[PDB]
A paper describes a structure:
The human [name]+ [name] p97, also known as [name], a potential target for cancer therapeutics, plays a vital role in the clearing of misfolded proteins. p97 dysfunction is also known to play a crucial role in several neurodegenerative disorders, such as MultiSystem Proteinopathy 1 (MSP-1) and Familial Amyotrophic Lateral Sclerosis (ALS). pmcp97 is a member of the classic clade of [name]+ ATPases and is an essential cellular enzyme. p97 is composed of six protomers forming a homo-hexamer with an N-terminal domain (NTD) and two tandem [name] domains D1 and D2 (1). p97 is an essential protein in regulating cellular homeostasis from membrane fusion, Endoplasmic Reticulum-Associated Degradation, Mitochondrial-Associated Degradation (MAD), Chromatin-Associated Degradation to NF-κB activation (2).
In order to assess the effect of CB-5083 binding in the context of full-length protein, we carried out cryo-EM studies of p97WT bound to CB-5083 in the presence of either ADP or ATPγS. Importantly, the N-domain is in the “down” position when either ADP or ATPγS occupies the D1 nucleotide-binding site. Although CB-5083 binding site overlaps with the nucleotide-binding site of the D2 domain and shares interactions with some of the residues that interact with ADP/ATP, the key inter-protomer interaction between R766 and the γ-phosphate of ATP is missing in the CB-5083-bound structure, preventing the generation of the type of quaternary conformational changes seen upon ATPγS binding to p97WT.
Numbering used by the authors:
A (entry chain G): 210 to 707, 728 to 768
B (entry chain L): 21 to 707, 728 to 768
C (entry chain K): 210 to 398
Write the structure that this text describes.
Amino acid sequence: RKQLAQIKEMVELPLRHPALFKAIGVKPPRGILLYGPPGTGKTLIARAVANETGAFFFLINGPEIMSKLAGESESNLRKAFEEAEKNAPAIIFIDELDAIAPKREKTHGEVERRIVSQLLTLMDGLKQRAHVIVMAATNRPNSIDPALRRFGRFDREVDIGIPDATGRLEILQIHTKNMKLADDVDLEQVANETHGHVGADLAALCSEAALQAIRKKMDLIDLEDETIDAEVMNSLAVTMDDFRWALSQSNPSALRETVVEVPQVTWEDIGGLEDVKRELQELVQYPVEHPDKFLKFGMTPSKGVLFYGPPGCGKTLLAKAIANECQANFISIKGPELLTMWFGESEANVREIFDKARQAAPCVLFFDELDSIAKARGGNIGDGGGAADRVINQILTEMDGMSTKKNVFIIGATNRPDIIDPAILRPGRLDQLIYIPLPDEKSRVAILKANLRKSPVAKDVDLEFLAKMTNGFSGADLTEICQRACKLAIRESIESEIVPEIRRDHFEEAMRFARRSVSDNDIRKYEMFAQTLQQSRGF
Amino acid sequence: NRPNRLIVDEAINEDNSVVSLSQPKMDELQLFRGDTVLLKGKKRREAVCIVLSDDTCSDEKIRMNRVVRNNLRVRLGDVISIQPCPDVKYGKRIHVLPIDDTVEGITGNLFEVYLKPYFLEAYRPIRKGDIFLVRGGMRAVEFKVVETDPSPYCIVAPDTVIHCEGEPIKREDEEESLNEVGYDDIGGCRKQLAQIKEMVELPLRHPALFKAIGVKPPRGILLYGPPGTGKTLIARAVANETGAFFFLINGPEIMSKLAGESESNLRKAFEEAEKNAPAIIFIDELDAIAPKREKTHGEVERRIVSQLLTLMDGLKQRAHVIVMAATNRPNSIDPALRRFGRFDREVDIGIPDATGRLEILQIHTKNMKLADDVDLEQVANETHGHVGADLAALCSEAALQAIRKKMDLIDLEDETIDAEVMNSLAVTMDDFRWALSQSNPSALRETVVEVPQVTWEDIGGLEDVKRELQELVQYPVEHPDKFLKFGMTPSKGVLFYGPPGCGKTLLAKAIANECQANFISIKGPELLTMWFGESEANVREIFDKARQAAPCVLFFDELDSIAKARGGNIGDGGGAADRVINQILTEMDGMSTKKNVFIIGATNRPDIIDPAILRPGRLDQLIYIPLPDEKSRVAILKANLRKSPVAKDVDLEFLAKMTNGFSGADLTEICQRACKLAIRESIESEIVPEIRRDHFEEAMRFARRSVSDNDIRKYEMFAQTLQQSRGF
Amino acid sequence: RKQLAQIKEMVELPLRHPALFKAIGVKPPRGILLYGPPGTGKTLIARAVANETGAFFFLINGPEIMSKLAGESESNLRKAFEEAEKNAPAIIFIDELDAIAPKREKTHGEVERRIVSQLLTLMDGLKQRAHVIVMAATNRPNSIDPALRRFGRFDREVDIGIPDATGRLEILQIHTKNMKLADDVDLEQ
Ligand SMILES: Cc1cc2c(C(N)=O)cccc2n1-c1nc2c(c(NCc3ccccc3)n1)COCC2
Ligand SMILES: Cc1cc2c(C(N)=O)cccc2n1-c1nc2c(c(NCc3ccccc3)n1)COCC2
Ligand SMILES: Nc1ncnc2c1ncn2[C@@H]1O[C@H](COP(=O)(O)OP(=O)(O)OP(O)(O)=S)[C@@H](O)[C@H]1O
Ligand SMILES: Nc1ncnc2c1ncn2[C@@H]1O[C@H](COP(=O)(O)OP(=O)(O)OP(O)(O)=S)[C@@H](O)[C@H]1O
Ligand SMILES: Nc1ncnc2c1ncn2[C@@H]1O[C@H](COP(=O)(O)OP(=O)(O)OP(O)(O)=S)[C@@H](O)[C@H]1O
Ligand SMILES: [Mg+2]
Ligand SMILES: [Mg+2]
Ligand SMILES: [Mg+2]
């Protein structure tokens, strides 16, 4: 939705008013570069915006250029540009570009850099003259010739990520609108258990689910005829088990990367921690929702917040809770995934993970368990020197190039804040330090009312009573208690088959098998860094 | 709607023309057990068969064998009409003559050995124009009738005389030979075949049905499996047994010709399929067609890659055409071809297990009649890494050994061979024994997909962990209705820990077979030898095989091997983390909770593994394997000698009564020593063959302890206090 | 000695009885791959087993294929296979193969993988039809295209190592038989 409107801002404005641009000095768009993983819809949206404007549209994807003999491939591309000039206004769209201009460490073949030079010539000479726009699409950032990303050829780029749950909701109906659904069927719950599906994945899933429904009646009906009657087409309708069996197959097996979703946790949804709820807003909410402030008094807002404390305190959720109330998206970067993408002595994939948070403004970036990088360099005892890395210096240098007026907010999280370099803790990258203490009574009662929201828990139990005994337990312990109680209740529910509700004794058994996620000595270690922390800066 | 139409499906019985049905259809058409049934098809032809009764079957379908499928010209996915015919028929005179197209090299009388055993205990009627295939003499030959008694009135009875003439007739174009591959010529891959049966014949037998509906039919299907799995055989069968056109281009004939016409040949191979719709396209090898990877050598070879991408990208609906390709390894296909719309659906065909390998022997030795003392059961149990090609080569060379064993002394030098000695030949025990002792089993070994055969009664003891493993595996497999009414979510990972030699691999297998799931065993050192240095690139594909083979239970045997290489005993200055551990712990988090894939880890020193995989959401439940108790100690002894003639003088419970502080390795090695000493005195007495009490008595005294005592209390001090180690 | 008898088990059996294999279902051998260090005798034994059977034998080693101009090298190999079909039974022997199909980390040159694809085509299409066997020899295991070691092309391999003392005894006399030796001379020590 966000990616479409800003195309609506740069395509139809310089097309529906050709003579308006001829008098004004504003240079219209020429080149638009597309992004996104394969199957995102790089072709569908281009075809829609090229066919629903009335202007001419010409299609050349990539391979038909390299499929023909040498010599005429360049001529075809050259004529495809002059044919668009005469019938102005026109538009040009290129489906895949990564296999067209691989002017990188490959540099194989004489004829293939010829077409790269040909396209560079055909775009470099594009003065105003007529009203023509070329557009290209690709799958990864490190696949476009850097000579094409210069100003005047490809200076404006849009990143289209994997849709979230509410983004994936509309994709189901925009393809199943001709499929009338029964009363007991809804598309809401089925689009909630998935988190990495794109339009192509959902289209394939619905197609095969419909095939399953077709065969479920063709196996017993056995109607062998050429033409089919409409008296049975209308009676057919997909059921619950079809969408259940569709996802249990191998079609969800796809590629997973940084997903852009919006959180759904707000102030009433959580409880307690009034001492840090009062403070996080002071440094996030106001310099987002109050543009008039923060420049009359001078000064400048922060960019970075480092979260620290006992493990299992729910730092990721605490960071999400503030990002959704400022009308910003959220990208979750957990520790080990930034380590598995490191390989050895070659990553070359850092600069592009920050731009997605920039095009999707406003956005709140989160680094979950940043302590993973220090794990690999040196842990526990450590090496002879500092725990610095070529992946840490490159990100701490990258976060300093941004202007203070951008709304991008980076948030770090760690669990052992004594081994991280003060280099990122410098006054100007990570200024404010915020401590996450153990959950109090108001949060302990809330976590229990939240982790069983979809269970038929009887009213015989008391929610406040559990938090009354539970004092020295962390979020992991509070969750695993409920997990154990539900696990024992679900066993007796099946055993009675040889009524299905959770009773007080079910929580009572889970009470006795409780353990402590954290010890005691590490606690006072954590709140001795809280009051005296500015002393560690610089030394 | 005339409820008599039945859907055609292949039969499972390995015999002559016998059609199986269900029980409601038995009483619906008022037909008895043994009766003459009438079958009607298209092209105005009549065929007869026998209805067989079955109860353990599917809901509603017929079982249509290939012998009369060619007789009635009916393929898979068509319709068949059945009706009773209570007509009394008696056979007196039948005339049959072979065709001179396949009788080369056969001399002598062929009616007293190929027609006598085939007719007795059959009572199978015949019609005019029936094409039935018989077996015998290392080959299969079909018969055809030209003139006989007026059809029908033909029943096999001993009172029917025969007489040969000695003049074959020329075969016409009305029928086809049965020597080609059919749907019944493939065995070993059963799950992989049915889901192809779900995506090939459905969008082909109903072309106009898809034109009205909005469901997009399949276009590209990518095959997998090690070489020799059968990537060509199944494709040829599914392309030839559907009636649609099939065109073959493997890979090398494209690159063998001169530059310029190779692309033209591929371009014309696609337009020739459009006009004669419906058609199908199959590509034998693809890894050598599109190597758009670190190779990128040669100008003309990426030209054909772009040509094929162009020819598949432009494939709109139009006609009903499907392209299929096969390969040998996952890291050999151009990633540009695996996009949505070209290759989005993939099937993994692994090495068949023992019961999978059983059928491959007979589907190639059916023409080889075997003696009484020979069976194919035991010979397919000692092997674990053979595919169809390996077994075919093994049987071919075993037959050659049998041929030479009589050609060395018979010395019959003649052009044509007689059938009087072909029938007398039969392979023996020593042939299959000597076949495997040669170098033909030397092949490539990888992850094999087998089903365990150990259940609750097969093992004993450990009631405290049998009671618990089921609570977290069995119910959220066999009870789909649960685990969402109460909310919550099932687990994915279980980590096994304790003294070495406790049988953790077997304990993990015991639960996987009772939930109707396959099993893949990943032992420690094999995932280390595939690591090399700074380059593995082979992790992402080892998890998808457990996903396509749902349900499946994955097992990591001795995960502690990875920590061994990074740092052991003392350890390094930091954590024992690795780029092979982070990439798998990140991969196991991308999966949805509703998948039925279950990963199980096993270790022996659970104090040096990173808590990163022990996070609450990857490895939540921790299960301890204690020392075997009395009930398991008696069971292991009754299990490890199941194939030995142990006398009744010994007592099974008595041994477990002395044995208290011994582990599974010790319990096994005691029996190994007892058998080893008994087998020596058995041979020494030759200068009776049963195990006596003293044989176990000597093994009793030479017993050792696999584990010490101090490590024990170390193991059960982590059992009660383990949640404290999470996070620190 | 051991390596020879098992060739005696797979060459003359499917050649001296052509019509016997036509009636039975046993698939005769097609491809036989040789091994051994250079000078082991990969050519001598092939010539002996091809000349002492009466069947036709055609020789193409390796380099004459790559020595000629581009375009006719493939035609020569193609015609060398059809010339053997008409005069059945026949046999085909290739002297060196490591320099014919280097489909490995080398992958240099356009025309040289062309002949690899040509030979793969000419062997892949070999159904029963006549009684023809192709044989090839090499010097090291990591020099054959893995695509050629598949089932049906090269699935049976023999390793011929360096002969031992008693193995080396006979080699002296099989070449010095025309050299009459004195009384005080012996080839044992
Ligand atoms: C499933 C869940 C697990 C978990 C864990 C854990 N160690 O697994 C830790 C913290 C919160 C957790 N939650 C959780 N999840 C949510 C909420 C919520 N309550 C408020 C809260 C969160 C963090 C802090 C204080 C209080 N708690 C609120 O609703 C949305 C999701
Ligand atoms: C050959 C064999 C060796 C072995 C060993 C070993 N250190 O070699 C350890 C554990 C079981 C072993 N088995 C074994 N194998 C089997 C069974 C069985 N008994 C039940 C059992 C298994 C593990 C645990 C408890 C009890 N034991 C059961 O039948 C199938 C195979
Ligand atoms: N965002 C989307 N919304 C709706 N349908 C979509 C979307 N993306 C893809 N589809 C469907 O998927 C089909 C194929 O889309 P593709 O063009 O293959 O996707 P893509 O992003 O262009 O990546 P390629 O072209 O496959 S490399 C389209 O015809 C649509 O039916
Ligand atoms: N699963 C199988 N069942 C029965 N026979 C098989 C099977 N797989 C292979 N065969 C036999 O082996 C012969 C050769 O099969 P291949 O096509 O070579 O196997 P493949 O899996 O296609 O790998 P290639 O083509 O050799 S790279 C077939 O003609 C069959 O006789
Ligand atoms: N095993 C052997 N027994 C007897 N003479 C041999 C043997 N091997 C080689 N020779 C002799 O050596 C000569 C040359 O043999 P070669 O063909 O060169 O050996 P090779 O094993 O084929 O390796 P190449 O062809 O040189 S790469 C033959 O003509 C024989 O005279
Ligand atoms: Mg597209
Ligand atoms: Mg094949
Ligand atoms: Mg030589």
